[PDB]
Amino acid sequence: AKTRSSRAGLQFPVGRVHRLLRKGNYSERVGAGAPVYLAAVLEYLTAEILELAGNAARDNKKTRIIPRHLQLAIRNDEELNKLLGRVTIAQGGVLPNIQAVLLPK
Amino acid sequence: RSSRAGLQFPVGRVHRLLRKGNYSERVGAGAPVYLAAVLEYLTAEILELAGNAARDNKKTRIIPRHLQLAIRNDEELNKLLGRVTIAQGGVLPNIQAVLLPK
Amino acid sequence: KPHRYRPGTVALREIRRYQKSTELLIRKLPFQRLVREIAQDFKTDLRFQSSAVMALQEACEAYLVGLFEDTNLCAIHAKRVTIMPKDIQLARRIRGERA
Amino acid sequence: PHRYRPGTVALREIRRYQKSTELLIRKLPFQRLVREIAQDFKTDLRFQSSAVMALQEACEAYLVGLFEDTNLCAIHAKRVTIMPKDIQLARRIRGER
Amino acid sequence: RKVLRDNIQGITKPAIRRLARRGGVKRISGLIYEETRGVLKVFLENVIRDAVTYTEHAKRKTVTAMDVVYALKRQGRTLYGFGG
Amino acid sequence: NIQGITKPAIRRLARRGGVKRISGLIYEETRGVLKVFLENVIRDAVTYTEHAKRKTVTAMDVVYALKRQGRTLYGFGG
Amino acid sequence: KRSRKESYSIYVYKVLKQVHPDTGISSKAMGIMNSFVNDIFERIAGEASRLAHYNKRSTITSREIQTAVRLLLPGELAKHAVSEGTKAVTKYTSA
Amino acid sequence: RKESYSIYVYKVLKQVHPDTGISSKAMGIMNSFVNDIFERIAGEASRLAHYNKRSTITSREIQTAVRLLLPGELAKHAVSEGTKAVTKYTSA
DNA sequence: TCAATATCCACCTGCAGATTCTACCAAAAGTGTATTTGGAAACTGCTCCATCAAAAGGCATGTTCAGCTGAATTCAGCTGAACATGCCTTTTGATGGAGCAGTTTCCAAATACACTTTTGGTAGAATCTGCAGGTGGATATTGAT
DNA sequence: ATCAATATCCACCTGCAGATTCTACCAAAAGTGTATTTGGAAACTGCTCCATCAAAAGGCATGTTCAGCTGAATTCAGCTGAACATGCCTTTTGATGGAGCAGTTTCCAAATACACTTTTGGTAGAATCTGCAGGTGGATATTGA
Ligand SMILES: [Mn+2]
């Protein structure tokens, strides 16, 4: 009954992750905690983006997160912006920004 | 084996590096061979151009600057190593015309 | 009158309008066509998954919008406000797209 | 009194330095900088002689590239004197800042 | 079917301007449009070429969305939203 | 400690870069960039060190760190 | 005659509901998040993969995943990650 | 212990230029070049195999990996020598 | 150009620090046999893709007009290159000692493995419902008097 | 200092394309008994890595001058945005034919697993050398009159 995920108190599939590691050819063998450790990092990171996205969708008056929100989220938090610096988000658009000089006198 | 494939580069050495490299479950028989030759070839490609670079400066011993001068002058190799930095290589002689007198 | 917005008023209006949204700016068909033309020149008799094309377009358009910013910055840098091919050329060089 | 016009040496210095490959930054001040920095991350650290050479070759070689790009930036604005702003542009476009 | 030709022109100027506005540009020189098509054709070719190469390797006649996503990956331009 | 990177050296580096005339503020700016570079390359290097339980930072540690930064270096695998 | 393709939607959704009980996520949105997890997963596992080799050690222990995080993740993101990762593992073992 | 390609590089340097010789550092660069390329070709082939749900890196993978990895001409010649070396291995 | 500087540059030359060649042992690479199996050939169901048809209204084009930008210039304050000085901080060269990477050698704990249960997820139908598309005043913002 | 002229803002409405749910099967974790390894933990090496010590020699730091470069102002042709009228062709929706992905099987040609036999390639001396490092002497390229 104790799915490895529940033992770690994680929401992500710890077993799923363990397997991907084995079949990914990252190493001949995988420790018993790695998948748990990593599964938690993907959870945290995921939870981190939803946190800022959900809000972005709140500001906009929407109850459903769309990509755009996701974009606004990642490009406004310095760190995520960098972690996903070479990442392109389909249907994301870009942060509103107009060079000062351009504006009217 | 390498001698069988008519190459200098070690087909076995490579086959060993591939299997133990985590690249995939199993390595086909001709893979290590093919790759080896591609590894040799490329080398020859750089040496021949650097070699010339040597004689080009009245030397007979290829050093770093000889490679860089051979790598950054060829468009293709330059592209292939465009994110590579050769230690002790220096830059190619270049001065913007706007900086010139007159 | 006739009412005439001064040059730059509508340009900024657009800049604000097109940044607040996320719809593709190139028309879907001409792009498709363009893609197929180019792909046909690499291997005849190819079939494209409807989305494979959306991808290319999602990327191409993101790429160019991204190029224009760096472009626009170079013009600003040369005191100008009009982006010119010259600006684009510098932006790509610096970038490493074609040193 | 023989005086070289201003800017004549520069070209001669460019021709000089581009023709060579030796490192430019003085080794000791550098190695010092290395150790100092690394200590902000770890204590009782020992750089194996070559490690510090790897860093210098790397570091110096980077700065040069940046300067080549900063030139074009300075040139692009019709100037000919690399300014700090030019370096900033160059780095911004590069994806560093 | 039909003969595809000069379709890099399908990329209308109004659009290029649009792409530029989203970019932040407020004043576009006239020589810009032909320049842009130039870069776009080159960017596209590379992304497509690579893509099609992944296609051929899987001995398939269809260009899948993943073939594009992997291509973009090699090119560094990582894309999210089309193939997990 | 960083001020050890003497102004004359920086000019030499810029000289190789094809630079002809150098502003005065540059020098400070260059030290900042230069510092951030090393700060980033070593941090990843020492991390690689620590993980190997070592106390001595070998060259391969710098090489690996220079690769993550996309600043690959040749000739130091020896 | 089926073809079950897996994803993280179930998990991405369980998490969205912990942070925003009233918020939801559309199709595309989910697909974006699915990519993000996969990418990140590939980066972490890839880096770890390289550390074990740089050290001639045939196995990827969680200790490698952690350095992979530190090297891969920037700033606080890393701190909280490393933190969150440990909590899960120490607990898991005591299970 | 602690190997390299030093030996070979030199054998190849002798074929193209019997009269010339290579420095230590230069030979060190050349030795770094081999590894990187090797690393790229392998890593790439490695992925093609994965994308295609196949657990074995064949020479066909190394090849496709080469077309993706190497630019213009280098790619062509690199493919030939690769295909040329394989045939001779299978012949005898 | 003429001339009076300073600067490079080949033309040769002499030893020492790298180079390259030798001379011999372990770690691999290559063999021989017995095992496993991965994916090429061979169908074959069925999504998905290529195509054709029609209507229409969202836009791409083209031509005017002229606002205000960019490019050409003019002009002089002052930043920063060329220099000749005076000094100290870098080079280097051992020499010695000692923290420390690197090796071996037992092995306890941690993994891998091969089955056998037992769910947790994914692939559809069945229910909901944000909000995409429009509608209209209420606001600003702009540009002309 | 005003006032039309418009484009943008927000809140409100309401059905339906796009989520949310609700159920069944089953590919995949999970639970356990075995069959290996793995990578520490002590033990010691020979490293290489700091540490002083101690001179000279560039190479750095300064204070002077003033060449000419970077900025600030003008000026004006004309490049490019804002508009408006035209009517083209991109969009939308549906409907099919069928090319060609993929899901299953069938099975050798091929890669892996041991357990040995032979040879190659890395090391550390041993026997060469290429370039460095200085030296003239004479064009070269600058620069003042
Ligand atoms: Mn064609």
Residue numbers in the entry:
A (entry chain C): 14 to 118
B (entry chain G): 17 to 118
C (entry chain E): 37 to 135
D (entry chain A): 38 to 134
E (entry chain F): 19 to 102
F (entry chain B): 25 to 102
G (entry chain D): 30 to 124
H (entry chain H): 33 to 124
What does the paper say about this structure?
The basic unit of chromatin is the nucleosome core particle, which contains 145–147 base pairs of DNA. The DNA binds on the surface of the histone octamer, composed of two copies of the four core histones, H2A, H2B, H3, and H4. On the other hand, the N-terminal tails of the four core histones and the C-terminal tail of histone H2A protrude from the nucleosome core particle. In the present study, we determined the crystal structures of four nucleosomes lacking the N-terminal tail of one of the histones, H2A, H2B, H3, and H4.
The H4 N-terminal tail directly binds to the acidic patch of the neighboring nucleosome surface, and is reportedly important for the compact folding of chromatin fibers. Similarly, the H4 deletion of residues 1–15 also did not significantly affect the overall and remaining N-terminal tail structures in the nucleosome. In the present structure of the tlH4 nucleosome that lacks H4 residues 1–15, no significant structural differences were found in the remaining N-terminal regions of both H4 histones, or in the crystal packing contacts with the H2A acidic patch. This is consistent with the previous report that the deletion of the H4 residues 1–13 did not influence array compaction. Therefore, the H4 residues 16–19 may function in chromatin fiber compaction. In the nucleosomes containing tlH2A and tlH4, the initial phase of the disruption occurred at slightly higher temperatures than that of the wt nucleosome, suggesting that the nucleosome stability was not affected by the deletion of H2A residues 1–9 or H4 residues 1–15. Since the H4 residues 16–19, which may be important for chromatin fiber compaction, were still retained in the tlH4 nucleosome, further deletion of H4 N-terminal residues may affect the nucleosome stability.
